[PDB]
């Protein structure tokens, strides 16, 4: 039964004496004992870890990208949480340390000495070179970026550098014969604390190190004052100024096991007791961080406060918070590839259902647009976060998620509503929308309070229309965090398949794949949940009045209901009542925010333009939509946008969702997280700390 004690991979005789030293105290307090084994470098250790002659090790943001790289796909076990000199974070900033007097402003860097933390590490490599890119004069990857660096710097100390290939980069790395620049602390100017020394020592002219490394290495503000910083403003700034003068602020390092059969718990087991009874004035007898100055920075980072178990769907890219993985992937492309990307907008189409629409669109866009869809909106969103994708028109409630993750509204799903029309849609006041509980006409008595334990129709969970608004009320009036027993059983897209509220749900034409978030479920969208009441099955549905009209007296043509008179249904008023379809501007549930294309702010603004142009290349406004393509026009299916959507328009300054959606809804939609929530919102709650 003894779960196999873990095996940490060490890249040096010290990383081992260290695991050894730790080992002692493990059986000494008798917690989850380990067994470390050696593999020369971080990359070398990764292999043992995955091909399990080992299991887990700690590595820098950069290396994760690698750790999670296809050849070996490993999972970000637990990142180091560092002191923040504010509130303890994982995301470290990136700056380059410079000797005041050397004065060579970033740009003015051509051909001096460069000290590095290693080949491939965050601020130690991936980050610097990338910004030093433009200047470098490198065709692209076919010509290894590797040579442009030396060709750029008269000298460099880059651990794990392919020295015999072009000498120049190990030129600055002191060392044994072997160990000179051998990727491990068997080389001084390595990692943070190592590379740092490099500088002070003369041969070291500039390095880019942890926004602390100096502080790490300097307990004398007079000796600290001995330094200055290199900033993207090209000018130099103070040390502690790493907050306002620096390159990229990447997420820390982390422990990582195989994305497969991690032992993750076993792992966390260790880290926990370790963080419980050593370091932090916990074990005056032993500690794991404050370690040696002779072989500085070890297994993790010295003084790296604590850590956090990364919850589970996170994979390489995911943990890497788009922006940085962008930088890294970009490190292996051509301005061609690059350029192209930056304007050829990636879109995620909620399912194969939308996947083809975009495909179509990918074709008429004159290759301006291109997509990879994802299962459910969540995954789509997530995807954008992963960075493979760029956008999707999100539903209010859905957008909520985006924001909590850091996504900002770009253009809103404008109603095409009538009033005093003109291209002014482009920027028109959002008429929001009116969700309403349209009840089936005939059945009159089934009024408000009375709903008690019925069959119900939903556009989805976590969505405006039907979910959010309705659900909240009920619970407000029933505390049913275990909702079900209010609505005997319904059909809503996304709940527990084996939910006691899905059932009603039907799969594709071939009746398979029921109770899920995507239109390829005859009941998903404002649309299908209408199909639900009409299918005389679910005895009550809420959504916006608009959807009704969308599919009444011929407004729509699918055989199933093309027939139903708009007079076939009543609309359930709050005050007991059940008003007419049309007249819900009294009767409705309430008015809520429309949808809107949301994005990673840093891509978004550029999108805004392309959409503005693109939409007029289609739209229930322009001329070509009538012709060879319609965006905000579906086929009533309402993919990406609604066929009734005039143009995606300008927000009213409402950049954050907290803005767009707004306090009340904003707040209430979290009350709901209470009862149950998604791993994704969890993940966001966890990364965007």
Match domain 92-250 to its CATH number in 3.40.50.1220, 3.40.190.10, 3.30.200.20, 2.40.110.10. Answer: 3.40.190.10
Same fold, 340-432+593-689 and 433-592: yes
Task: Say if residue 72 carries a ligand binding annotation.
Answer: no
CA atoms of 295 and 26, how far apart (whole Å): 23
Residue 124 is assigned to a ligand binding site: yes
Alpha-carbon gap, residue 526 to 546, rounded angstroms: 9
> CA–CA separation, 267 vs 256, rounded Å?
9
- Write the DSSP string, 142-207: TS-HHHHHHTTSSEEE-TT--GGGSGGGTTT----STTTT-SSTTSSS-HHHHHHHHHHTSS--EE
Q: Is 60 annotated as a binding residue?
A: yes
Residue 116 marked in a binding site: no
CATH number of 433-592: 3.40.190.10
Ordered alpha helix ranges (H), 539-671: 545-550, 584-587, 601-615, 657, 663-671
* Domain residue ranges of the chain, discontinuous segments joined by +: 1-91+251-339, 92-250, 340-432+593-689, 433-592
Handedness of CA 403, 405, 408, 410 (dihedral sign): negative
| Sheet strands (E) in 304-344 | 306-309
Cα–Cα distance, 562 to 541 (Å, whole number): 18
Dig out the tokens for 271 from the structure. Answer: 């880290």
Question: Is there a binding annotation on residue 382?
Answer: no
192 annotated as a binding-site residue = yes
Residue 430 labeled ligand binder: yes
Pairing of strands 595-600, 590-592: unpaired
- CA 468 – CA 171 distance, rounded (Å): 62
Are the C-beta atoms of 122 and 131 separated by less than 8 Å?
no
Token pair 């081992």 is at which residue?
Answer: 16
Decide if 259 is catalytic.
yes
SS3 21: helix
Catalytic residue among 73, 243, 282, 454: 73
Q: How far, in Å, CA of 320 to CA of 158, rounded?
A: 23
Asked if 533 contacts 524 with a C-beta cutoff of 8 angstroms, the reply is no
Q: CB-based contacts of 423: which residues, under 8 Å, 6+ apart?
A: 621, 647
92 is in an annotated binding site: yes
- Is 291 catalytic? The answer is no
**Of 12, 41, 259, 456, which one is the catalytic site residue?**
259
CATH architecture assigned to 1-91+251-339:
3-Layer(aba) Sandwich (3.40)
Residue 499 near residue 431 (C-beta atoms within 8 A) = no
Q: Say which CATH topology domain 340-432+593-689 has.
A: D-Maltodextrin-Binding Protein; domain 2 (3.40.190)
């Amino acid at each position: 039964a003894p779960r196999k004690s873990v095996r940490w991979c060490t890249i040096s005789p010290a990383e081992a004496a260290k695991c050894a030293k730790f080992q002692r105290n493990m059986k000494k307090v008798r917690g989850p004992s380990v067994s470390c084994i050696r593999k020369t470098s971080s990359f070398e250790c990764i292999q043992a870890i995955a091909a399990n002659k080992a299991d887990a090790v700690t590595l820098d943001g950069g290396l994760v990208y690698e750790a999670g790289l296809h050849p070996y796909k490993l999972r970000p076990v637990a990142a180091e949480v560092y002191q923040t000199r504010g509130k303890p974070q994982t995301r470290y900033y990136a700056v380059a340390v410079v000797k005041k007097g050397s004065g060579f402003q970033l740009n003015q860097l051509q051909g001096v000495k460069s000290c590095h933390t290693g080949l491939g590490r965050s601020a130690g490599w991936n980050i610097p070179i990338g910004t030093l890119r433009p200047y470098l004069n490198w065709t692209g990857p076919p010509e290894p970026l590797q040579k442009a660096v030396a060709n750029f710097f008269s000298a460099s100390c880059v651990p794990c550098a392919d020295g015999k290939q072009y000498p120049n980069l190990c030129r600055l790395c002191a060392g044994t014969e072997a160990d000179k620049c051998a990727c491990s602390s068997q080389e001084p100017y390595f990692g943070y604390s190592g590379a740092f020394k490099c500088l002070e020592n003369g041969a070291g002219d500039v390095a880019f190190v942890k926004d602390s490394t100096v502080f790490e290495n300097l307990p004398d503000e007079a000796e600290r004052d001995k330094y200055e910083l290199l900033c993207p403003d090209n000018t130099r700034k103070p040390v502690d100024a790493f907050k306002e003068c620096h390159l990229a602020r990447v997420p820390s390092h982390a422990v990582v096991a195989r994305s497969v059969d991690g032992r993750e718990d076993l792992i966390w087991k260790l880290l926990h007791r370790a963080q419980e009874e050593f370091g932090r004035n916990k074990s005056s007898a032993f500690q794991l961080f404050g370690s040696t100055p002779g072989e500085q920075d070890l297994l993790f980072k010295d003084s790296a406060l604590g850590f956090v178990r990364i919850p589970s769907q996170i994979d390489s890219g995911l943990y890497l918070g788009a922006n940085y993985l962008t930088a890294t992937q970009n490190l292996r492309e051509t301005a061609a590839e690059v350029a192209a990307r930056r304007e050829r907008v990636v879109w995620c189409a909620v399912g194969p259902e939308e996947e083809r629409k975009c495909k179509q669109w990918s074709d008429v866009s004159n290759r301006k647009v291109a997509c990879a869809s994802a299962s459910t909106t969540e995954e789509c969103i997530a995807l954008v976060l992963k960075g493979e994708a760029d956008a999707l028109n999100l539903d209010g409630g859905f957008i909520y998620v985006a924001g909590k993750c850091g996504l900002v509204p770009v253009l809103a799903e404008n109603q095409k509503s009538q009033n005093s029309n003109a291209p002014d849609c482009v920027h028109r006041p959002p008429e929001g929308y009116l969700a309403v509980a349209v009840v089936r006409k005939s059945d009159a008595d089934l009024t408000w309070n009375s709903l008690s334990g019925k069959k119900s129709c939903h556009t989805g969970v976590g969505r405006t229309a039907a979910w959010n608004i309705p659900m909240g009320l009920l619970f407000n009036q029933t505390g049913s965090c275990k909702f079900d027993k209010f609505f005997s059983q319904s059909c809503a897209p996304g709940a527990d398949p084996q939910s006691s509220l899905c059932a009603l749900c039907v799969g594709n034409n071939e009746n398979e794949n029921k109770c899920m978030p995507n239109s390829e479920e005859r009941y998903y969208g404002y649309t299908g949940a209408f199909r639900c009441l009409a299918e005389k099955a679910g005895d009550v549905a809420f959504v916006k009045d608009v959807t009704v009209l969308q599919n009444t007296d011929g407004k729509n043509s699918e055989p199933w209901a093309k027939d139903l008179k708009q007079e076939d249904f009543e609309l359930l008023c709050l005050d007991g009542t059940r008003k007419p379809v049309a007249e819900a501007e009294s009767c409705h549930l309430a008015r809520a925010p429309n949808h809107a294309v949301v994005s990673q702010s840093d891509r978004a603004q550029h999108l805004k333009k392309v959409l503005f142009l693109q939409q007029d290349q289609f739209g229930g406004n322009g001329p070509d939509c009538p012709g060879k393509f319609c965006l905000f026009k579906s086929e009533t299916k309402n993919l990406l946008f609604n066929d009734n959507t005039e143009c995606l328009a300008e927000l009213q300054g409402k950049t954050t969702y907290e803005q767009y959606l707004g306090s009340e809804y904003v707040t209430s939609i979290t009350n709901l997280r209470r009862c149950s929530s998604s791993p994704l919102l969890e993940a966001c709650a966890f990364l965007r700390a």
